[PDB]
Amino acid sequence: AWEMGVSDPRKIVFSAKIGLALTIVALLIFYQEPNPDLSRYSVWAILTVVVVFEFTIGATLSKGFNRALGTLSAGGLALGMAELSTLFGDWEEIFCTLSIFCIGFLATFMKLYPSMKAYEYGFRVFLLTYCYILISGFRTGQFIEVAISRFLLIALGAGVSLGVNMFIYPIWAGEDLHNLVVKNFMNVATSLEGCVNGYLRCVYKGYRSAVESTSQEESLMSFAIWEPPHGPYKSFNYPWKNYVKLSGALKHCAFTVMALHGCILSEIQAPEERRQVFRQELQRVGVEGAKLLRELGEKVKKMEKLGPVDLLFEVHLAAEELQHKIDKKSYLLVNSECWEKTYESASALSLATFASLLIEFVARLQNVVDAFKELSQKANFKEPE
Amino acid sequence: AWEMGVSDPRKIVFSAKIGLALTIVALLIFYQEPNPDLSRYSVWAILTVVVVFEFTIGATLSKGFNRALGTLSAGGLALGMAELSTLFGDWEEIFCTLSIFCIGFLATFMKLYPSMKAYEYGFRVFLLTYCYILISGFRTGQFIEVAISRFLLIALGAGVSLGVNMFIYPIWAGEDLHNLVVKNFMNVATSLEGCVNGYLRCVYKGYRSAVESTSQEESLMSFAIWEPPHGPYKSFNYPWKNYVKLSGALKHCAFTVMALHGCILSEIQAPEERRQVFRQELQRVGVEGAKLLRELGEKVKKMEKLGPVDLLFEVHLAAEELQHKIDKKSYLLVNSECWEKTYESASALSLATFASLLIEFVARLQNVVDAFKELSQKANFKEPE
Ligand SMILES: CCCCCCCCCCCCCCCC(=O)OC[C@H](COP(=O)(O)O)OC(=O)CCCCCCCCCCCCCCC
Ligand SMILES: CCCCCCCCCCCCCCCC(=O)OC[C@H](COP(=O)(O)O)OC(=O)CCCCCCCCCCCCCCC
């Protein structure tokens, strides 16, 4: 409660924004002359205010567009069907009851398709609207009056929500994508250092946050776009896809870190006295990889290009020294007597797996540097200080 | 569309069940004497029918319980606050508008806690109810009448939905958990065989479905409990947790299969002519592991206990033969000349990683056999034919 509020002041702002919107809708109704027939309609503005308020501006705009297309296609089919109904004559109710069944079936069967498993709220409004216009007395006169007053209150509530959401401390989805990329870059370096230290000591969240985030990145990329230019992002079409391309290169790099974490929780392990022969070479690769990932995170955060020197020279030298050391002392992993116990041989062969996985991790960083160059080129980053 | 319907006949049943419930709520309103004031309330039964209908019986019961606790705590605070309001006197509206803000803030701030990120629908109903009872004329007389008629229509819609959901082709969540475990057991064996074949040939969905399913398993475990005894599950407290314990042992086994799939997409690879020396030993382990996983899946599906013989004898013999073969020909992975090129040495050392990962996969199956014995003991499985 208090802890999350002090750590996260955005949540308190969002909650006081919704409180203010509700108190404004309330004020605009408490100051009208007391009427019995006005209080009954008031519930629709409260429902609109409590349904259309989202966390981001792009989310609010996209969901409002979808809900308006739903409500209008529903009112359209309804008005394009009650006319066919009138033609039937006496057997009018049977036609309506037989059309509500088919609309319910199609609107419940088209919401269950794996490709259409996000926009359930454009289908629910369609069904609710179509059903409400055939069992409410379309042929009376009080119908149109009630419909008009309800739509008026709904439009008032949506206008209030949209103004109190767009003009007071707006939250943008592009800043959330921008910050998420930097956080993942930091976490992968922390996990790599923790893994090397744990293996050499006589991590889950780091690689897990990276591996399990593509859905969030694509959702935030789907909303950023609605939003208009603001602050550092001033072009109309901002290359938001290059951020997902760099996050994918980093996930490919983080899978080897997940396999090095898995090497520490295995049933077959190597003798401790034999792991202390390669400690220096193993620790150098970790130090250099963490330094490189942290410098790439700092360059992404500041929106700066890469300088003249090469960023992969020390890590390559470290991995070549590691390979030389392994070649010098490779008689500790195999048994030369048998050249022509199972547990002992597997425990000796277990160290080579850790070393090979570290070398594969160092070989997978060139694609991440290439994706960073592509993003720094398409987004018009500034020349380094 | 048609393809998914022919493959999945359950979706068509669910959609025709919702269509039937809507057509029944419609019939019970079209046959009452034409009234202008009755048609206006009809929308609430349609809304209830379209909101309370879930895919499973346990989900419907749990969500109905939560929505009823919400609505009653809201109406309770409202009636326990409007009285304090009356005491204020002239400055009555100010008190109401000042209480709606604090309720909106607390109900928007308590829905954002990571532990409370499932029951947003017990908070939305609370807010909607509390707000609707303070800006609707609590001190008039028409208020109680409208409230009573609206609650009557809501209860009618919920009763119809619950009867047309529980008495026509009910879907149970325990059969979905039961079937999901068997599907994951089949998929892991398919992935293992595909991985060994791809590596030896001159898979994603299998291990991915297992790795990414704990959330589904725990959701299905959270509803299968509200459901009453039926069919093969006749005890009141059915051990549904042992199914999740066996799924977790299988996920631990599937992580090595994900690392063997990752070994095929690496930048450093071994010469093809050197991979053909261990083909037979490598293929035997795969055949035996797939046979064991398929026999465990068949025993879980039929609800049968294990027989007298040991199920891990052939796989253990295969892995010991593999280790012997590797020991006989280990001069192909290292360089003895240097005993005291980087790419060549890494490519030679890459085969040992595949072999060590296969041996770790074979060493991780005893815990899965132990978890299966525990489930076959707590669930009172039958003695093998
Ligand atoms: C380019 C312009 C874009 C338009 C901008 C305005 C944005 C409007 C988006 C919100 C509109 C949907 C309402 C959402 C709130 C809500 O109450 O929606 C609440 C629920 C949805 O609930 P959930 O989505 O939470 O499950 O649906 C409804 O009850 C609304 C359906 C109508 C209610 C009965 C009134 C009949 C309609 C009267 C008007 C006639 C329309 C048809 C004429 C042909
Ligand atoms: C042993 C107890 C078991 C009881 C089982 C009964 C299950 C019924 C649960 C349904 C209740 C929630 C409604 C769901 C449908 C819906 O319309 O709910 C629709 C929306 C919820 O929308 P979403 O959840 O989809 O976002 O919320 C509402 O509009 C409901 C608010 C109540 C309706 C306004 C009128 C006030 C209520 C009048 C009665 C006063 C009650 C308080 C008296 C103290």
PDB file of N, CA and C in Angstrom, chain A residues 144-185:
ATOM      1  N   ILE A 144     -37.584   6.323 -28.642  1.00  0.00           N
ATOM      2  CA  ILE A 144     -36.598   7.261 -29.172  1.00  0.00           C
ATOM      3  C   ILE A 144     -36.154   8.250 -28.103  1.00  0.00           C
ATOM      4  N   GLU A 145     -37.085   8.701 -27.262  1.00  0.00           N
ATOM      5  CA  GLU A 145     -36.739   9.664 -26.221  1.00  0.00           C
ATOM      6  C   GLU A 145     -35.716   9.081 -25.252  1.00  0.00           C
ATOM      7  N   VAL A 146     -35.982   7.869 -24.758  1.00  0.00           N
ATOM      8  CA  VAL A 146     -35.069   7.231 -23.815  1.00  0.00           C
ATOM      9  C   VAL A 146     -33.724   6.966 -24.476  1.00  0.00           C
ATOM     10  N   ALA A 147     -33.742   6.535 -25.741  1.00  0.00           N
ATOM     11  CA  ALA A 147     -32.484   6.272 -26.430  1.00  0.00           C
ATOM     12  C   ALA A 147     -31.663   7.549 -26.558  1.00  0.00           C
ATOM     13  N   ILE A 148     -32.319   8.664 -26.882  1.00  0.00           N
ATOM     14  CA  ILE A 148     -31.602   9.918 -27.069  1.00  0.00           C
ATOM     15  C   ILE A 148     -30.991  10.373 -25.752  1.00  0.00           C
ATOM     16  N   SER A 149     -31.767  10.312 -24.667  1.00  0.00           N
ATOM     17  CA  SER A 149     -31.242  10.794 -23.393  1.00  0.00           C
ATOM     18  C   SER A 149     -30.093   9.918 -22.902  1.00  0.00           C
ATOM     19  N   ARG A 150     -30.184   8.605 -23.141  1.00  0.00           N
ATOM     20  CA  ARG A 150     -29.104   7.714 -22.734  1.00  0.00           C
ATOM     21  C   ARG A 150     -27.838   7.976 -23.541  1.00  0.00           C
ATOM     22  N   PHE A 151     -27.976   8.175 -24.855  1.00  0.00           N
ATOM     23  CA  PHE A 151     -26.801   8.490 -25.659  1.00  0.00           C
ATOM     24  C   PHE A 151     -26.202   9.834 -25.270  1.00  0.00           C
ATOM     25  N   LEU A 152     -27.038  10.795 -24.877  1.00  0.00           N
ATOM     26  CA  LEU A 152     -26.523  12.087 -24.438  1.00  0.00           C
ATOM     27  C   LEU A 152     -25.667  11.932 -23.189  1.00  0.00           C
ATOM     28  N   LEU A 153     -26.169  11.188 -22.202  1.00  0.00           N
ATOM     29  CA  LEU A 153     -25.388  10.999 -20.983  1.00  0.00           C
ATOM     30  C   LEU A 153     -24.104  10.217 -21.258  1.00  0.00           C
ATOM     31  N   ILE A 154     -24.156   9.254 -22.182  1.00  0.00           N
ATOM     32  CA  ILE A 154     -22.949   8.490 -22.492  1.00  0.00           C
ATOM     33  C   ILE A 154     -21.906   9.379 -23.160  1.00  0.00           C
ATOM     34  N   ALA A 155     -22.342  10.272 -24.051  1.00  0.00           N
ATOM     35  CA  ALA A 155     -21.387  11.168 -24.691  1.00  0.00           C
ATOM     36  C   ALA A 155     -20.803  12.161 -23.698  1.00  0.00           C
ATOM     37  N   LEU A 156     -21.606  12.613 -22.732  1.00  0.00           N
ATOM     38  CA  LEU A 156     -21.071  13.526 -21.727  1.00  0.00           C
ATOM     39  C   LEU A 156     -20.006  12.835 -20.883  1.00  0.00           C
ATOM     40  N   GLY A 157     -20.271  11.590 -20.477  1.00  0.00           N
ATOM     41  CA  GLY A 157     -19.306  10.884 -19.654  1.00  0.00           C
ATOM     42  C   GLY A 157     -18.017  10.595 -20.398  1.00  0.00           C
ATOM     43  N   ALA A 158     -18.121  10.238 -21.682  1.00  0.00           N
ATOM     44  CA  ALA A 158     -16.909   9.963 -22.445  1.00  0.00           C
ATOM     45  C   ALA A 158     -16.103  11.234 -22.684  1.00  0.00           C
ATOM     46  N   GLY A 159     -16.777  12.362 -22.925  1.00  0.00           N
ATOM     47  CA  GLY A 159     -16.048  13.605 -23.108  1.00  0.00           C
ATOM     48  C   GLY A 159     -15.315  14.034 -21.851  1.00  0.00           C
ATOM     49  N   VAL A 160     -15.966  13.886 -20.693  1.00  0.00           N
ATOM     50  CA  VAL A 160     -15.312  14.250 -19.440  1.00  0.00           C
ATOM     51  C   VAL A 160     -14.104  13.355 -19.192  1.00  0.00           C
ATOM     52  N   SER A 161     -14.281  12.040 -19.352  1.00  0.00           N
ATOM     53  CA  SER A 161     -13.160  11.128 -19.145  1.00  0.00           C
ATOM     54  C   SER A 161     -11.992  11.455 -20.068  1.00  0.00           C
ATOM     55  N   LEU A 162     -12.273  11.729 -21.345  1.00  0.00           N
ATOM     56  CA  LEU A 162     -11.180  11.974 -22.279  1.00  0.00           C
ATOM     57  C   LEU A 162     -10.463  13.287 -21.995  1.00  0.00           C
ATOM     58  N   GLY A 163     -11.179  14.315 -21.536  1.00  0.00           N
ATOM     59  CA  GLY A 163     -10.493  15.559 -21.220  1.00  0.00           C
ATOM     60  C   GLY A 163      -9.683  15.475 -19.941  1.00  0.00           C
ATOM     61  N   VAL A 164     -10.217  14.786 -18.924  1.00  0.00           N
ATOM     62  CA  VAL A 164      -9.488  14.632 -17.666  1.00  0.00           C
ATOM     63  C   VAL A 164      -8.400  13.579 -17.764  1.00  0.00           C
ATOM     64  N   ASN A 165      -8.326  12.863 -18.881  1.00  0.00           N
ATOM     65  CA  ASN A 165      -7.243  11.917 -19.097  1.00  0.00           C
ATOM     66  C   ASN A 165      -6.158  12.482 -19.994  1.00  0.00           C
ATOM     67  N   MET A 166      -6.522  13.331 -20.954  1.00  0.00           N
ATOM     68  CA  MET A 166      -5.540  13.871 -21.880  1.00  0.00           C
ATOM     69  C   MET A 166      -4.909  15.174 -21.410  1.00  0.00           C
ATOM     70  N   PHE A 167      -5.570  15.949 -20.547  1.00  0.00           N
ATOM     71  CA  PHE A 167      -5.036  17.260 -20.198  1.00  0.00           C
ATOM     72  C   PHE A 167      -4.407  17.356 -18.812  1.00  0.00           C
ATOM     73  N   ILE A 168      -4.403  16.289 -18.018  1.00  0.00           N
ATOM     74  CA  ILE A 168      -3.771  16.307 -16.699  1.00  0.00           C
ATOM     75  C   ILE A 168      -2.783  15.149 -16.585  1.00  0.00           C
ATOM     76  N   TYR A 169      -1.490  15.469 -16.587  1.00  0.00           N
ATOM     77  CA  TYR A 169      -0.420  14.490 -16.430  1.00  0.00           C
ATOM     78  C   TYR A 169      -0.573  13.245 -17.309  1.00  0.00           C
ATOM     79  N   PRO A 170      -0.609  13.405 -18.629  1.00  0.00           N
ATOM     80  CA  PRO A 170      -0.778  12.241 -19.508  1.00  0.00           C
ATOM     81  C   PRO A 170       0.367  11.247 -19.363  1.00  0.00           C
ATOM     82  N   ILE A 171       0.034   9.963 -19.477  1.00  0.00           N
ATOM     83  CA  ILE A 171       1.010   8.878 -19.503  1.00  0.00           C
ATOM     84  C   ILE A 171       1.096   8.345 -20.928  1.00  0.00           C
ATOM     85  N   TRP A 172       2.316   8.232 -21.447  1.00  0.00           N
ATOM     86  CA  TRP A 172       2.559   7.799 -22.817  1.00  0.00           C
ATOM     87  C   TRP A 172       3.135   6.387 -22.831  1.00  0.00           C
ATOM     88  N   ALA A 173       2.758   5.600 -23.844  1.00  0.00           N
ATOM     89  CA  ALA A 173       3.246   4.229 -23.978  1.00  0.00           C
ATOM     90  C   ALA A 173       4.624   4.136 -24.626  1.00  0.00           C
ATOM     91  N   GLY A 174       5.051   5.173 -25.348  1.00  0.00           N
ATOM     92  CA  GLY A 174       6.367   5.132 -25.954  1.00  0.00           C
ATOM     93  C   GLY A 174       7.468   5.326 -24.938  1.00  0.00           C
ATOM     94  N   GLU A 175       7.182   6.058 -23.862  1.00  0.00           N
ATOM     95  CA  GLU A 175       8.171   6.188 -22.806  1.00  0.00           C
ATOM     96  C   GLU A 175       8.266   4.906 -21.998  1.00  0.00           C
ATOM     97  N   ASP A 176       7.198   4.106 -21.984  1.00  0.00           N
ATOM     98  CA  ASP A 176       7.240   2.832 -21.281  1.00  0.00           C
ATOM     99  C   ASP A 176       8.020   1.804 -22.082  1.00  0.00           C
ATOM    100  N   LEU A 177       7.877   1.820 -23.409  1.00  0.00           N
ATOM    101  CA  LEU A 177       8.699   0.932 -24.227  1.00  0.00           C
ATOM    102  C   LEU A 177      10.172   1.330 -24.149  1.00  0.00           C
ATOM    103  N   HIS A 178      10.441   2.637 -24.252  1.00  0.00           N
ATOM    104  CA  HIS A 178      11.804   3.143 -24.150  1.00  0.00           C
ATOM    105  C   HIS A 178      12.449   2.726 -22.834  1.00  0.00           C
ATOM    106  N   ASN A 179      11.715   2.833 -21.721  1.00  0.00           N
ATOM    107  CA  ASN A 179      12.298   2.494 -20.427  1.00  0.00           C
ATOM    108  C   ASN A 179      12.426   0.986 -20.228  1.00  0.00           C
ATOM    109  N   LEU A 180      11.511   0.207 -20.817  1.00  0.00           N
ATOM    110  CA  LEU A 180      11.572  -1.243 -20.682  1.00  0.00           C
ATOM    111  C   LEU A 180      12.805  -1.813 -21.369  1.00  0.00           C
ATOM    112  N   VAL A 181      13.190  -1.242 -22.513  1.00  0.00           N
ATOM    113  CA  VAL A 181      14.377  -1.760 -23.196  1.00  0.00           C
ATOM    114  C   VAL A 181      15.625  -1.575 -22.329  1.00  0.00           C
ATOM    115  N   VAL A 182      15.758  -0.406 -21.700  1.00  0.00           N
ATOM    116  CA  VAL A 182      16.916  -0.141 -20.850  1.00  0.00           C
ATOM    117  C   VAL A 182      16.908  -1.050 -19.626  1.00  0.00           C
ATOM    118  N   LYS A 183      15.725  -1.290 -19.053  1.00  0.00           N
ATOM    119  CA  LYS A 183      15.663  -2.162 -17.886  1.00  0.00           C
ATOM    120  C   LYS A 183      16.080  -3.586 -18.238  1.00  0.00           C
ATOM    121  N   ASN A 184      15.683  -4.070 -19.418  1.00  0.00           N
ATOM    122  CA  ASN A 184      16.081  -5.420 -19.809  1.00  0.00           C
ATOM    123  C   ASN A 184      17.583  -5.499 -20.062  1.00  0.00           C
ATOM    124  N   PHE A 185      18.162  -4.428 -20.615  1.00  0.00           N
ATOM    125  CA  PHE A 185      19.605  -4.423 -20.838  1.00  0.00           C
ATOM    126  C   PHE A 185      20.366  -4.493 -19.521  1.00  0.00           C
TER     127      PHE A 185
END
